[PDB]
Amino acid sequence: AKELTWVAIGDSITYLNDHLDETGNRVSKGYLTRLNEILPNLKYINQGHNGWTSGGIAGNIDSLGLIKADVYSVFLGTNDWWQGRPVGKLDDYQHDNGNTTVYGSFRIIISKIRQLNPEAKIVLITPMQRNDFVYIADAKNNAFGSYQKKNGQTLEEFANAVLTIGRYEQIPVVDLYHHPLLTLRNMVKFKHLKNPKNGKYVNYKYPAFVNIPFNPENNEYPYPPAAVNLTYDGLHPSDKGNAIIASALADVFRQLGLS
Ligand SMILES: [Cl-]
């Protein structure tokens, strides 16, 4: 019945597929679930680790319980960007300079996959753009969007590194970063914020909201249900976001002959 085991390696965007309560139930189907609806012979294993960088994945690579499978996807980098990890250069992927850059981490991860199954298909997924993130369970956990550099690096540099590794290895890449539907303006409808001039709440869409302070101690959660668009919190995909991701991933799986 064309059954294929698919290990999905990732961060919270992958993790949350099977923990919808952690989205505040804003999401009903994650991208693994949706991929499987499109390609029902693909049997996912969720190796998404909540909050992890590619550095964390690579650094713990022998302790994740990774198993032999027919196809692996790797969807990492957004947390590396936020944490300011150096992207590195292709040389860090080609040679063992340690788990000290994103390129280095991908070297470790792809090498492990090939150890597990030298015959397995591999797909890389670039980070999606992200707007201002506010954690639904604790608003003190927040981050600015990818319109701004973090530690001198753009999120686009991380997407470009993934694309470069894909080209070097002749491994297909799902480019979410440059996906024409996955734009900053469509991440959230508005941020619900106090107007500094009068203390009253106002719906500020993007890019207006970049100019309005958010104080999590003096402001309700700034992304009520009405704010959901491609994400429910600035960062993590909504049902709509997950559908677009799953469709893009399904196209690549088809091209690889996995359908
Ligand atoms: Cl699972």
Side-chain angles (χ1 to χ4, degrees), residues 1-120 122-199 201-216 218-239 241-259:
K2 285 182 151 189
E3 172 180 307
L4 298 173
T5 295
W6 162 37
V7 172
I9 297 172
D11 49 36
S12 52
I13 295 169
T14 299
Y15 171 87
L16 289 166
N17 184 84
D18 295 84
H19 300 286
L20 302 172
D21 57 312
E22 290 176 60
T23 73
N25 302 296
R26 298 244 174 124
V27 176
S28 66
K29 290 182 183 182
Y31 84 88
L32 311 185
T33 298
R34 295 178 180 280
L35 183 285
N36 170 259
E37 294 176 342
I38 303 166
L39 306 176
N41 59 308
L42 270 287
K43 306 295 182 172
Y44 77 77
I45 291 174
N46 189 329
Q47 280 278 2
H49 296 262
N50 194 9
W52 288 32
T53 62
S54 71
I57 295 286
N60 287 277
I61 201 68
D62 295 322
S63 303
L64 300 186
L66 289 170
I67 68 170
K68 183 181 186 170
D70 301 295
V71 53
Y72 299 76
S73 59
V74 182
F75 189 177
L76 294 166
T78 198
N79 296 324
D80 301 70
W81 169 78
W82 180 247
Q83 292 183 25
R85 275 194 94 218
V87 169
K89 297 179 173 175
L90 183 59
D91 179 83
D92 297 294
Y93 179 86
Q94 291 164 328
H95 307 280
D96 189 353
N97 300 329
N99 186 28
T100 59
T101 61
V102 178
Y103 275 102
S105 296
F106 274 72
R107 169 186 45 79
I108 294 174
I109 294 162
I110 289 166
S111 294
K112 178 69 169 177
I113 290 172
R114 288 172 171 160
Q115 170 208 87
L116 288 165
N117 188 359
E119 297 170 32
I122 306 178
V123 173
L124 311 181
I125 307 183
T126 68
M128 189 168 79
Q129 295 186 53
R130 48 188 287 177
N131 219 315
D132 287 4
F133 162 67
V134 185
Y135 186 33
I136 202 162
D138 186 353
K140 295 182 179 183
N141 190 329
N142 58 71
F144 59 79
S146 51
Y147 57 81
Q148 178 64 291
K149 285 180 165 178
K150 178 62 178 274
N151 295 16
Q153 304 185 126
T154 65
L155 183 57
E156 186 179 18
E157 290 178 65
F158 290 73
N160 290 343
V162 172
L163 289 164
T164 300
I165 295 166
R167 287 188 238 107
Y168 179 66
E169 289 280 17
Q170 306 188 40
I171 288 303
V173 178
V174 176
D175 195 349
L176 303 179
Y177 191 96
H178 301 102
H179 194 297
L181 298 181
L182 301 181
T183 55
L184 278 177
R185 72 187 79 94
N186 281 323
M187 296 294 155
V188 293
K189 300 291 187 66
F190 60 88
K191 221 175 174 186
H192 174 71
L193 301 168
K194 290 187 178 180
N195 181 341
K197 293 193 180 181
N198 62 23
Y201 281 98
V202 171
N203 59 310
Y204 293 101
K205 72 179 202 177
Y206 182 82
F209 74 62
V210 184
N211 309 123
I212 308 294
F214 172 62
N215 181 9
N218 185 69
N219 204 110
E220 302 165 339
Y221 185 70
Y223 293 136
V228 176
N229 195 340
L230 291 177
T231 69
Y232 63 83
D233 63 6
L235 169 61
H236 300 104
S238 62
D239 279 330
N242 284 315
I244 293 162
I245 295 172
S247 177
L249 183 55
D251 291 341
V252 168
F253 281 177
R254 290 190 173 99
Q255 293 161 3
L256 280 176
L258 305 179
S259 63

